[PDB]
Amino acid sequence: HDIAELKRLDLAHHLPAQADHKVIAEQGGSRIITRAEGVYIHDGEGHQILDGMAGLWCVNVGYGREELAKAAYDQMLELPYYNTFFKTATPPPIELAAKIAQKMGGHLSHVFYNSSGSEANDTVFRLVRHFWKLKGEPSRTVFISRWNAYHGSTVAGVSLGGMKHMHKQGDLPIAGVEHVMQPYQFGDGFGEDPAAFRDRAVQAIEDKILEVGPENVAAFIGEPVQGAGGVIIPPDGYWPAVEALCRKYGILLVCDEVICGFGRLGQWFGHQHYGIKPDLIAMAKGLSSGYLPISAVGVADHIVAELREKGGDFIHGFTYSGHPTAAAVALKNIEIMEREGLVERTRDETGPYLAQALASLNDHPLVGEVRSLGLIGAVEIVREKGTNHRFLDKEGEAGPIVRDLCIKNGLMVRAIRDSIVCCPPLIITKAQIDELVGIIRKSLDEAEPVLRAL
Amino acid sequence: HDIAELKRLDLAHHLPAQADHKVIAEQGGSRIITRAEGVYIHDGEGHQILDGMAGLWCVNVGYGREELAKAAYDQMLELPYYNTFFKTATPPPIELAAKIAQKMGGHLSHVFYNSSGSEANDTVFRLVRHFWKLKGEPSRTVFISRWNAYHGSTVAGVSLGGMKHMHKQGDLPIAGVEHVMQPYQFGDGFGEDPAAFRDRAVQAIEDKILEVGPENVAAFIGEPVQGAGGVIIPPDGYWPAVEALCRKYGILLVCDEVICGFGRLGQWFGHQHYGIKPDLIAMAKGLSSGYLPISAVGVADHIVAELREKGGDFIHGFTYSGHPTAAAVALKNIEIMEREGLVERTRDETGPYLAQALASLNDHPLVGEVRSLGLIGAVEIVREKGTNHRFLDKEGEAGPIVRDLCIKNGLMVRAIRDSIVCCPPLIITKAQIDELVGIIRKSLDEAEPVLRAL
Ligand SMILES: *Cc1c(COP(=O)(O)O)cnc(C)c1O
Ligand SMILES: *Cc1c(COP(=O)(O)O)cnc(C)c1O
């Protein structure tokens, strides 16, 4: 690869996702990632980086899976594409659907296919509203979400998410979406009794239901653990109370499993860790370990019952809904996870090991809190031990400085506000977990003098 | 394949796209498509079908491309995924971006990546509104589209499209979207002077611009040829007049090229046939001939100038934006089109031949009009020669009957209202075009007694 030429062509012709394009121009083009293997990625200048983010929270089986390349090749020779529009389907999405249903359990019996996690929440959005029309309760239209939730980058996904700066671009949210407090103990409930803070966060949802009018509410939606919001792990009992809330008012419960699904929290799906039974789930990312674009909505049997008994078109779906090659890769991806026990390994070994490894950072002068569940975790940067006080009293200054030193030191982790987050491939070894934590500590040590000087 | 078991699993776990699920159950599950080669698909019961729809308006280079499977395999081994979020990129999407820009020409210099045509129009929606905020004209927010337009199946895509029945599901359109008359001469301007009808259809947009307030309008969006709306080919001079209209009021022009792009109308993009210069275009489907999911928005240089000079995050993008494997297949797909001259062949050979072949149906007692451009076409079914009168005076009864006879006779075509439409792979031969037309005539002959009996 002519790296300099790729960088020139990058600026001349490519608009990267969720980027400041002035910043991209000022660095001479995107940093070029050329190769990858295991848990390591390699850039155009030969730098090896431990990918603590598994691509984009998604490469769960790790890089270098010739088995997945082969599954793609074989399906593309036999039948690279056909639609599911013309009362037709193809073998891969049907077999994948049965496999996903087995992993979903509960009353989640069917799947509707898309390509991205964002589209999945568009499908959630339209199917839920159509479901309530079929049920003869057309007033149930309003979705209740949370501030700092992330539910994608479509107009609907942005609206369902609670990122205020993202809302602004496109003049969102669209109508019929309400947002309430997130259960972020460290930031918003520091020093509160966990049980009391949890009750506050659930009560906020009930207050909105009553404000909107329960007969007007269609569903509550939330990530089991908030991902893009900064690995926000809810207090114990939160999710059971939210489930009980939804049943109290007869509204649907929707869990966005796009990050938490497929082994991330030590379960096939995040909601299974919490023992709740959502009516719909959105899934993507780890579904195929990012090897090909595919997404799905898991749909409860009683919603399918309305579609099947009332009939009528559900006028919703995408050209690449059920893409046979993408489905074939996702099926083989799940089989690898099964064969290698990656879900249970995360629950029983790498997860606990990451927790203990991150806990060794607790004594650092910059660290206010570490938290993790399975192979997702977060390190809080504070200017004062024993508080949640942030440098310059302006969240988002310290984070990027520590992040950039991590990347400099050979570790890809993200800074969300002043939180260092990690989400490595499920195949990460204990030694590599120790390497990850060691680089963070090294970077925190280097960050300490610059942060004190702000 | 155990076809019987696949059908059982289909009903138990799969929800097909844009389907009536009661109807799918009543036929014992989806019809199983197992393999394809050239322009032919094969079902679970061994039926070989001439695919007159190229998958879903998309398999432009035809089935059986080992070269495209190989490109996917090779990229997945080297680097199956990395994100464009972290100021990062990978070689394939950058090289693809330069190639797409070369085919777009004009001031369309950059591409923003997504997976589906629907997402691309979400990108159009948010980028257009963000552009106008960067420009210091924040009142420019409203999109003007047309009835019977189709722009995808996300909330925004449904809202931008003009399918009233689709709007209902999800309680759409969202705010800031207006719809005006489509330029459908046969249905809505039968017996009108074409120039006068064209002027009528252009004036409707200006009337809407003036009603909304020109300072409040962000853009007009439209398919060069309306695909899902029934292959609606606009009258001569329509598109130059629409472009002049947009320039008159300083609003952006957006062309949805998801179907019309990549050779379909005899040009790399539909708008190039009409000599207009859109500010943004949406593309998908033929971009990769459906071999892998990928989409893009082509962006004019002056839009990029706002992003690059004002800076700030454009908080928009998807996990699979710039997917390296999908991009590599799309790049090789374009190279196949170049090598085999598919754009020019469509313009100079197969396009004209299809027109000549379809014109032979003009003498059929059921045919009211045939029209085509490149390798997209439509046959109108009427109950009275020389009129646009429809059977039972209820558009959509005759269509499905003829369609089902076509499929029984070995040709996949779709019925949109009482229009039989076709969109075959660009590699279709003249002999196969004659087979396509012959089956349509055979099916019309069989349909005639049943239609007369309604
Ligand atoms: C990644 C993310 C999405 C968006 O998924 P895309 O594939 O990028 O469209 C939606 N929900 C959650 C929880 C996510 O983390
Ligand atoms: C196909 C279609 C879309 C939607 O594309 P998907 O990939 O199915 O989401 C958008 N615009 C036009 C003109 C289309 O024909």
CSV table of N, CA and C and ligand atoms in Angstrom, one decimal, chain A residues 318-319, chain B residues 116-118 121 150-152 223 256 258-259 285, ligand 2:
chain,number,residue,atom,x,y,z
A,318,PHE,N,-35.5,-4.2,4.0
A,318,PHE,CA,-34.4,-3.6,3.2
A,318,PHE,C,-33.9,-4.6,2.2
A,319,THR,N,-33.4,-4.1,1.1
A,319,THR,CA,-32.8,-4.9,0.0
A,319,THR,C,-32.0,-6.0,0.6
B,116,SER,N,-27.1,0.4,3.5
B,116,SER,CA,-28.4,0.2,2.7
B,116,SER,C,-28.7,1.6,2.1
B,117,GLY,N,-29.5,1.5,1.0
B,117,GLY,CA,-30.0,2.7,0.4
B,117,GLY,C,-30.9,3.5,1.3
B,118,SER,N,-31.6,2.9,2.3
B,118,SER,CA,-32.3,3.6,3.3
B,118,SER,C,-31.4,4.4,4.1
B,121,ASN,N,-30.2,7.6,2.6
B,121,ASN,CA,-31.1,8.7,2.6
B,121,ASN,C,-31.3,9.3,4.0
B,150,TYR,N,-40.1,6.5,-3.8
B,150,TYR,CA,-39.6,5.6,-2.8
B,150,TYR,C,-38.1,5.9,-2.5
B,151,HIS,N,-37.9,6.1,-1.2
B,151,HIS,CA,-36.5,6.4,-0.7
B,151,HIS,C,-36.1,5.6,0.5
B,152,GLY,N,-36.7,4.4,0.6
B,152,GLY,CA,-36.2,3.4,1.6
B,152,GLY,C,-37.2,3.1,2.6
B,223,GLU,N,-36.0,10.3,-7.4
B,223,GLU,CA,-35.4,9.4,-8.2
B,223,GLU,C,-35.4,9.9,-9.7
B,256,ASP,N,-31.9,10.4,-6.0
B,256,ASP,CA,-31.8,9.1,-5.4
B,256,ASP,C,-31.4,8.1,-6.5
B,258,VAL,N,-30.3,4.9,-6.2
B,258,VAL,CA,-30.1,3.6,-5.7
B,258,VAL,C,-30.5,2.5,-6.7
B,259,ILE,N,-31.5,2.8,-7.5
B,259,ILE,CA,-31.8,1.9,-8.6
B,259,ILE,C,-31.2,2.4,-9.9
B,285,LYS,N,-27.5,-1.0,-3.9
B,285,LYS,CA,-27.9,-2.1,-4.8
B,285,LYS,C,-26.9,-2.4,-5.9
C,2,LIG,C1,-34.1,0.3,-2.9
C,2,LIG,C2,-34.5,1.7,-2.7
C,2,LIG,C3,-34.1,2.4,-1.5
C,2,LIG,C4,-33.8,1.6,-0.3
C,2,LIG,O1,-32.6,0.8,-0.3
C,2,LIG,P1,-32.4,-0.4,0.7
C,2,LIG,O2,-31.0,-0.9,0.5
C,2,LIG,O3,-33.5,-1.4,0.4
C,2,LIG,O4,-32.6,0.1,2.1
C,2,LIG,C5,-33.9,3.7,-1.5
C,2,LIG,N1,-34.1,4.5,-2.7
C,2,LIG,C6,-34.5,3.9,-3.8
C,2,LIG,C7,-34.8,4.7,-5.1
C,2,LIG,C8,-34.7,2.5,-3.8
C,2,LIG,O5,-35.2,1.9,-5.0
